[PDB]
């Protein structure tokens, strides 16, 4: 009961950024695969993450942070994190997502991104959600495309993939391109 | 016995803004339906709510905060929150209200608003209580109309409803339009 | 040359909220006519205004503050102040204006409000600008109507006019109702 | 002699971010045309700019800030500002530029951007310099294209132009696409 | 389960710089053999190491710190430490390593250095990793040579070995000289 | 008379790190040629240099800082800076040097480096002075070789020269290889 | 196991300056015989020693502090303290030693001093270790002579022995005069 | 008249440690000859000397500091500094002295040391004054011998002279060996 779930999809759900899962968030973010995908170069310390959780918690006016839950089992189980950095001046946000090592390839990322887009479009009233992802990360490309993102173009020589200089793909999503039924509309109506 | 009830209606009651219910207030305020109704775009953190409860508690000179109780059962059970921001210079206040997910549609909001208006008119000696509510939120419109509010007009293009730009309805209430018997008069006489 | 003018109309102009005019802003705001029009009940001190100017200056992210200049003479002369409190979440702002004692009735308020609306619509990208003004203040009503505001309704018994309890008129403006040519478009094109 | 010039082109030059020009930087940045081009919605105060200059000055490890000088006259005259926010992890930077009201259309922006790219490529050893510019700002598009930037794509509905929701064009530059002779190579060889 | 292992080789593995092992890190670093190999002259205190662990933990932006685990047994057991001081301006890092007294001569240092080089090359995207080691320390020379380092030269009379003034050997490693399969590539692909 | 000269060579001399020349030190260090030679990527601010001069001045226990004077004229004139970072544990130091734009190619760097080596060897009692210099900087190579440095080797791919990844040459100097007469011996005997 | 032993001789050993033995260090240092031998005139308080232990612990860059253990029994037992104050500028140190009341005359002081000299010569790379000891303290003279110290001379009238003004003997030790096998060499080879 | 002289000899005199001569004290102490004689390895900064003068001034309970004056001219002229660090527990002090570059070889050091010894013996009631001086510094040896110091012995390999490891001579002085008439006795009798 301690795990609150706000949006419930068919396969995944979103909840608050609970403080009981700071260690799990650290362990998820420190995985080498996540570091390669994000492009971060150095591991962060658990103490620094614990200290930074408070500053993340106070600064929630222009920041969306959700815990992704797997709803296929009897009870929800946290599997990843989604975040949107909101620029209230232009109604746009920047989207990031990561899942656990054992929860990838089961589809959860697609519905997690779709639910995050639903929340950003129908609750935060954002006009555009965009992201930057390294080109070789084709799985993330497919997940974002099926979630509702569209390709903008390639920013040449602005990232590293296994030490090699590669471009990154810029993608964006708009409310009129949002696929599937919206859970938020079910909440309102 | 810890749950103090000040005003007792037929279906609902009002009590103090207890500190034992900060987590419940957070959970009520973080519901997607409440966020859509209020028009808030980003969820707030539990730690920030716990920290802000103190600043709410000290600043009570020009702020009314009540906990709504359901009195249909054997014991009172908290179901929502009401608040009035008082401007002592002109004897006016701004009214907000929200109930829990499982307590809506049973009428409790109407008597909660009526009791809050009774307290504001006959204890706080306010000359006018007003609110701003999004136009598509028709249930709140009906609740406020039956509670004693009257429609002023529509403020064009000043809010978002499921990402769509919509107007909001401005409403006000005056003591001479207060319906039904007053509990405060029973307290005094 | 020290008086910077950003927007230049036919009769009036807008400039920055200069620190060399804090005493003049105080003297303008302390006039009994301005106190009656705004509805403020107690005079403010010059020292408090000087201290508060800094806090006004730092907090400019969601606040527009202009100095109104009379351009009918050879050189610009400050005659009043305009301000818009911006709510970036919904792209709306609240508008206030006051002129000097000897500068009223010459029309400067109308073009000052029109230029402020032009700046808010075409630079700040606001979807709605609204204000609250006491009903007996008919001159301000006419100025706002000719500037581009439209009447919403009357909020009953929410203000004092010469000690008498009176209602206040709520007005709003939208970009599609903006009259006349836009100076900002001339700046861009 | 107080105006130091580091890079000297045929028409323009770059110098340090002098503290004697904080007021001029403020006046340049506060022009309505610059606000429209950047997409900033509210004017900043002179006191806030003076206070922020120090924090800009200390934080120079990952920030390039230049003053653009017009070298067509007998002595250099400052006309604008260029800045590159450097991300040392991936050797990329984000580029912004603005000129004075009376210095546009004379070509100075093109050589200013070219010299900034030369400095970033041959001194800062950046692999990619990118920018985001509103689509209707066609003059900036042409200036960046002739300076050495290439179009990536359009980010839909992520900015405002005169109150209208418009897309912004993403551009990038790479060392192998740098046009013209390099001044830095003349410095080294 | 508390011992997290990120990279797993055939004989050794790398994990985070856990706070539960500060005393063990102190005891490893205070061994006379480690002091002779590093060239440190005075022992450090346990209290100073405990205090300094926090400052090490916060400063992780340009610092890699791993705990070396022996994977030959049933469960991982910490045996040493590896560290890389990263200079993000030139994509280079300085490498140090030490093992426990009872864990030397079993080969663990070679694979520990190889895995650290793999992490630095394919996750941190470093172009060169270098170290300085005293010339008489021939075992470390052989370990670094088999791990992937190449000899640069000897810096004359810049260190002490058992009180005698000796030179130190400078070594470096580049991605194109990295031997063996890469674990990070297995993580990505 | 304010310019103190400690060591006097035939062409150049060394003096204290005077506080009257902080602006000149800034201007010398900010030259693009000096930035290319050192490998620094971003310019530093004058205010930051003025603030950092104090911290340089207090920390003089393990730091040598000299002002290079040209003694060919009637009076000494400052032309550059030399610095040695001393590691008292092993009696070694790291050497850097830069001259002004108009003072290069006249030989002053060679005698400045020779006098700095004389001071480090015969006053600081250092056993080895070493430096790291980019390979394409052949003029500095020749200056260091004639001053008394000897080549150690090349550290592959650890620096940038005009945006190109290049190696840097490591050099060292020992007292027994010090050329020419020593001024310090003339001081003592 | 809590008692760490670094250097192990035939009769005595050296370990870290443990914080669990602050009271024992106080009791050893407060003995009247130790006060007479050192020449200290007033007893120190236990609280002051406990407070000063921290400042001793942080300041370990130029300070060697060991706990002397008696290794003749089954388990090591602390019997005294040795300390060397290191002057890194000239590679020299000042040596002091004291043992417990019941541990003197068994030879432990000789091997404790010899092991401290071994550590200072072969780990700290000190060129000279010196001490000052009162002339009537003949037992300490013999211990230092057999440990490896040589007599320099007598400093006339610079100390008190039982209230009588006496001279003190100055002694020094050099690496080439170090007797017996070195444990540190066994550690290295 | 500002130059106070306490003890007046035939050729030299002693005065207070005036604050008007901090720059002159710095310049005297920074001379390469003084650095070689004392054995200091790095120059000190003028700002650090100015800051440290205050801490020298407050701490005068166990510190004698004099300014040496040349009395051969019409008016006293400062030529050097003498200092005695007093250990009040044993009535002993450590003596240092330095003169200006142009004031050596005229004998002033001998009478300066003699007057300092007179002050220490007959005013401070010290039983022994000692010093440590490098062996090759034969001029200081002769000056101390004629002043009243006697040789104790040589501390082997504890100092550097022009980079060469040399011994230092230890000397002491006692009241019964004080030569010549005492000025302090003339003051008292
Ligand atoms: C990308 C990531 C965040 C999650 O996205 P994702 O879950 O992998 O993307 P998907 O949801 O499409 O994975 C679903 C896979 O299951 C398959 N699948 C399809 N239908 C399915 C179903 N009904 N049930 C189960 N699996 C299904 C899909 O084909 C897909 O394989 P594919 O993506 O190669 O086409 C995760 O891979 C990750 O943690 N990456 C590391 C961090 C990172 O890269 N972040 C992004 C940086 S911007
Ligand atoms: C609006 C809100 C705060 C509570 O008001 P409310 O309880 O829904 O309004 P009501 O009391 O009229 O709901 C009573 C319903 O029960 C019905 N009802 C009538 N008589 C009843 C009775 N005797 N017993 C039970 N139910 C009855 C009413 O017809 C009404 O349906 P209707 O409102 O559609 O006409 C709640 O809906 C809510 O939490 N909204 C989200 C937050 C929010 O919107 N706040 C306002 C923003 S300004
Ligand atoms: C309202 C106020 C801010 C300025 O607005 P304003 O300048 O008075 O409104 P106007 O510009 O229409 O005054 C112009 C008058 O000149 C007349 N006029 C018309 N054309 C004109 C022209 N070409 N040239 C000169 N005068 C002209 C107009 O008829 C108008 O009279 P009217 O307003 O009664 O119809 C000023 O009156 C004031 O300082 N009030 C006190 C503070 C206050 O009330 N603030 C508002 C609280 S919300
Ligand atoms: C864009 C800006 C920063 C400077 O760039 P710019 O100087 O206008 O771009 P240019 O250098 O090409 O202007 C040169 C003009 O002179 C013309 N020109 C060509 N050759 C010329 C020559 N030899 N001499 C003089 N003029 C010449 C060019 O055709 C060009 O006209 P065009 O740009 O429409 O084709 C300036 O317009 C500005 O301040 N904008 C507001 C702030 C802003 O928009 N910043 C960018 C937000 S990302
Ligand atoms: C150097 C040090 C850090 C670890 O490196 P290392 O483990 O000793 O180097 P190695 O891995 O090659 O030791 C493996 C030995 O086992 C032998 N070996 C070879 N194959 C083996 C196998 N399959 N299984 C077991 N042992 C094997 C090797 O021949 C080697 O002996 P050698 O190094 O003399 O040739 C460790 O010695 C140490 O702690 N030193 C003190 C601190 C220090 O010196 N740090 C470096 C300062 S820069
Ligand atoms: C390198 C630097 C610091 C000064 O060193 P330098 O003065 O250039 O080296 P030199 O003293 O040899 O220059 C003397 C030149 O004059 C010539 N020369 C020879 N004899 C001469 C004489 N008697 N009189 C005048 N000139 C003479 C030499 O041939 C030499 O040319 P060369 O160096 O190409 O062979 C300066 O070039 C500089 O500021 N560089 C930028 C910063 C930098 O690179 N620092 C080093 C980074 S580690
Ligand atoms: C001096 C002191 C620190 C320890 O040094 P020490 O142990 O007394 O000196 P020793 O090791 O030689 O004592 C060993 C004695 O055992 C005898 N001995 C010789 N061989 C022995 C053996 N194999 N086994 C046992 N005893 C032996 C020695 O003859 C010696 O007697 P001696 O010193 O009079 O010749 C201790 O006496 C002490 O605590 N003094 C008070 C503090 C102090 O004075 N500090 C020094 C101020 S600088
Ligand atoms: C040592 C020092 C502090 C001053 O001492 P000093 O003045 O040189 O020693 P003196 O007074 O003997 O110099 C007098 C010289 O004049 C000669 N002299 C003798 N009688 C003389 C007279 N009547 N008139 C003039 N000169 C005379 C002496 O023979 C002597 O030469 P000598 O010392 O080689 O024999 C000074 O040399 C100095 O500044 N040294 C650098 C700092 C330093 O070394 N400090 C000591 C470190 S512990």
GROMACS .gro file of N, CA, C and O in nm, chain E residues 62 68 101-102 117 119:
model
   24
  818UNK      N    1   3.494   1.394  -1.170
  818UNK     CA    2   3.615   1.367  -1.246
  818UNK      C    3   3.704   1.267  -1.174
  818UNK      O    4   3.827   1.279  -1.176
  824UNK      N    5   3.820  -0.365  -0.607
  824UNK     CA    6   3.853  -0.486  -0.682
  824UNK      C    7   3.807  -0.607  -0.603
  824UNK      O    8   3.835  -0.621  -0.484
  857UNK      N    9   4.772  -0.747   0.102
  857UNK     CA   10   4.898  -0.818   0.122
  857UNK      C   11   4.888  -0.963   0.077
  857UNK      O   12   4.981  -1.017   0.015
  858UNK      N   13   4.777  -1.029   0.108
  858UNK     CA   14   4.759  -1.169   0.076
  858UNK      C   15   4.700  -1.199  -0.060
  858UNK      O   16   4.671  -1.315  -0.090
  873UNK      N   17   4.097  -0.011  -1.735
  873UNK     CA   18   4.121   0.049  -1.866
  873UNK      C   19   4.000   0.033  -1.957
  873UNK      O   20   3.967   0.125  -2.033
  875UNK      N   21   3.684   0.016  -1.863
  875UNK     CA   22   3.585   0.113  -1.817
  875UNK      C   23   3.622   0.254  -1.860
  875UNK      O   24   3.536   0.331  -1.904
   0.00000   0.00000   0.00000
